């Protein structure tokens, strides 16, 4: 069961609101493993508060380092589980166009496109 599956919409709307009261600048990002992934390590945490000046490239490096991937290992971060957005895009721009109706930004990571 994913975060969307185990937390009601109404509760998630409230979560976003609680987060923004404490962190008016940060982008709330849900980062989950693709359900068919068997190769990448499992990230220990799923909920990330990301400064609004970070770009996708920087976020990708941050997650790869947290997974302690070697430079040779493959890693993709799919926004909304499908959209491949340019790695140069600032996260605030990703948030503005790809955020969910509940106000969270959803990503899935895997070894494939």
């Amino acid at each position: 069961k994913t975060f969307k599956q185990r937390r009601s919409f109404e509760q998630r709307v409230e979560d976003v609101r609680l987060i923004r009261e404490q962190h008016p600048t940060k982008i709330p990002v849900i980062i989950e493993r693709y359900k068919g992934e068997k190769q990448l390590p499992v990230l220990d945490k799923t909920k990330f508060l990301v400064p609004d000046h970070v770009n996708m490239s920087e976020l990708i490096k941050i997650i790869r380092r947290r997974l302690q991937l070697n430079a040779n290992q493959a890693f993709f971060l799919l926004v909304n589980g499908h959209s491949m957005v340019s790695v140069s895009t600032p996260i605030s721009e990703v948030y503005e166009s790809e955020r969910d109706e509940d106000g969270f930004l959803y990503m899935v990571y895997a070894s494939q496109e």
């Binding site: 945490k45 990330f48 508060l49 770009n55 920087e58 941050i62 380092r65 140069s88």
Partner: peptide
Amino acid sequence: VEEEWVIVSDEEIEEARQKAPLEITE
């Protein structure tokens, strides 16, 4: 009560900004 939310730190952002490959917007 335990923290739910990882605050991505300035240290890890700066480590990622100091690694190639560097992406340039505009």
